[PDB]
Design a protein around this ligand. Structure first.
Ligand SMILES: [Zn+2]
Lengths: 126, 70, 275, 97
């Protein structure tokens, strides 16, 4: 019963908001997406150890208590910069550039692949 | 009854009150004020306020709900 | 048949106090609950007690009135000295005026389904800043019963037209879907003398002399204002905007006079009484 | 869940021992009073305080804002770099130290 009372009290228009430094008298300060700051006598349904400054929390649309912890969102353009299509041009499709191809591969792919050949030497990979 | 009424008049300008800036007066019982919310309003003046204090940039306090200059 | 404009909803002091307490606790969220009372007759409805509905995520909706909570609450109050019926439901509109939302109309319709006399009561907690108690009561207008059936409340007396509706309610639909009902606070003795104890001024403070240093400060400062004032009187009599003489002289003289008389008189009584 | 958040705001001139001018962060300027029991001397111009969002009365003067931008600007890993890893700058290291 207590959990379903929480559930009915967890309807989600959330006011996503940033966390600011926590206080003792364990309790949090919130800056809303509407650029107004609140203090919470108790943080809410999330635990203090999870939260941290500059976090994204979904709070109650009216009481502004924190009741959800959110994955950080950078920007729509930044996500648009991410490659999802994964293009297909092969290395064989590149002509004459074999030395440049080798340089780029050894600089980029090898640190991703192994990291053992570099660490066995102690060098910082490029 | 007049003591009661004057007590109510005093009770009008009790905290909380929103601060704003005084614009030029319109009539003896009203003036225009721009609240620190940013918005401007045409508001009745509380008759208890001494008029000489009303410089055209003075900081004043208005009723939180009715914006009444009090 | 029809209801009349002289219909009076009698709110006792205890129910009224519980209404403001629940409203001032629930803000910024609204709060709802069921009023306990009785329909004594057609021309008035009495409420004597009220209790709070636990808050939920449904807002103030028909969903919010919990059946098992209401049944348990009614049963427990029945075996404590109040087997009243639910005459209606109160409600809180924080900040916004005493109007009725569209979601606030269907719930009152559901309450009317139980009893046609079931009134809704809306209480603004924030706007009740001071001894101004901002509260109103509503009952639905049954569509056609106004559209073609015409005036929904018989005007048999002048008791219903002695109040002015609030423009906010007219914007939100007063006299079109719901009509207001005159509010009457049926207070009585043994309930007003108790409330006079919040500021009673016990005889302990009745016979104190305050502090002579502070009273000296008041007297001296008021005297400085007297002289600064009488300067303007001397300037102003010559005349042949807050005219200082009348207003400020009468106020300052009254205050100083009464303060000094009270202080000296209390000092004399304490001198003669305390050995 | 029953609890309700309080409004943060910087404070200004203390008009009397009870009436104060708070300024809610990115908000209006009010005149408000401390609740009943809080100290009044420490309530000086420049103290972050919480406001009850029904009467705006002062309660719970907070220490000061950290502004998580600044938190990131402090709790950032600088590395394990020691003076014995910087080379050829001995005079400049002496000056900086
Ligand atoms: Zn409503």
């Amino acid at each position: 019963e207590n959990s379903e009372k929480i559930k009915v009290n967890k309807t989600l228009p959330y006011l996503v908001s940033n966390v600011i430094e926590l206080l003792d008298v364990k309790c949090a300060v919130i800056k809303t997406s509407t650029r107004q700051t609140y203090f919470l006598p108790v943080i809410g349904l999330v635990d203090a150890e999870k939260l941290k400054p500059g976090d994204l929390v979904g709070v109650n649309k009216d009481s502004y208590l924190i009741l959800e912890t959110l994955p950080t969102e950078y920007d729509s353009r930044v996500k648009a910069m991410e490659v999802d299509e994964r293009p297909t041009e092969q290395y064989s499709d590149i002509g004459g550039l074999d030395k440049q191809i080798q340089e780029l591969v050894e600089a980029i792919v090898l640190p991703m692949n192994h990291k053992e050949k570099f660490e066995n030497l102690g060098i910082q990979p490029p | 009854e007049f003591l009661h009424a004057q007590e109510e008049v005093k009770r009008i300008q009790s905290i909380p009150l929103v601060i704003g800036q005084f614009l030029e007066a319109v009539d003896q019982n009203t003036a225009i004020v721009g609240s620190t919310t940013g918005s401007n309003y045409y508001v009745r003046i509380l008759s208890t306020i001494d008029r000489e204090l009303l410089k055209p940039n003075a900081s004043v306090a208005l009723h939180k709900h009715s914006n009444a200059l009090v | 048949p029809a209801v009349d404009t002289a219909e009076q909803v009698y709110i006792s002091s205890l129910a009224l106090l519980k209404m403001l307490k629940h409203g001032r606790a629930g803000v910024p969220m609204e709060v709802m609950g069921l009023m306990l009372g009785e329909f004594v007759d057609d021309y008035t409805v009495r409420v004597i007690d009220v209790f709070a509905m636990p808050q939920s995520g449904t807002g103030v909706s028909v969903e919010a009135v919990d059946p098992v909570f209401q049944a348990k609450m009614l049963d427990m109050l029945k075996q404590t000295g109040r087997p009243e019926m639910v005459v209606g439901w109160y409600h809180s509109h924080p900040g916004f005026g005493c109007w009725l939302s569209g979601v606030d109309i269907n719930t009152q319709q559901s309450f009317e389904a139980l009893s046609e006399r079931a009134v809704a009561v809306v209480v603004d907690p924030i706007q009740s800043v001071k001894g101004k108690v901002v509260i109103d009561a509503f009952r639905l207008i049954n569509a056609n019963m106004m559209v073609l059936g015409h005036e929904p409340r018989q005007t048999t007396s002048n008791l219903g037209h002695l109040n002015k509706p609030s423009i906010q309610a007219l914007i939100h639909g007063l006299n079109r879907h719901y009509y207001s009902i005159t509010i009457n606070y049926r207070k009585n003795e043994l309930e007003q003398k108790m409330l006079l104890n919040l500021h009673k001024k016990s005889w302990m403070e009745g016979l104190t002399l305050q502090d002579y240093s502070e009273h000296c400060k008041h007297n001296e400062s008021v005297v400085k204002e007297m002289l600064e004032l009488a300067k303007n009187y001397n300037k102003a009599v010559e005349e042949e905007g807050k005219q200082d003489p009348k207003r400020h002289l009468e106020e300052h003289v009254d205050v100083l006079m009464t303060s000094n008389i009270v202080q000296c008189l209390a000092a004399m009584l304490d001198t003669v009484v305390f050995k | 869940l029953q609890s309700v958040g309080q409004i943060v705001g910087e404070v200004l001139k203390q008009l009397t021992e009870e009436k104060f001018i708070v300024k809610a962060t990115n908000g209006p300027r009010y005149v408000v009073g401390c609740r009943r029991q809080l100290d009044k001397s420490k309530l000086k111009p420049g103290t972050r305080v919480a406001l009850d969002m029904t009467t705006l009365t002062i309660m719970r003067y907070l220490p000061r804002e950290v502004d998580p931008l600044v938190y990131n600007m402090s709790h950032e890993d600088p590395g394990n770099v020691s003076y014995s890893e910087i080379g050829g700058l001995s005079e400049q290291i002496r000056e900086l130290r």
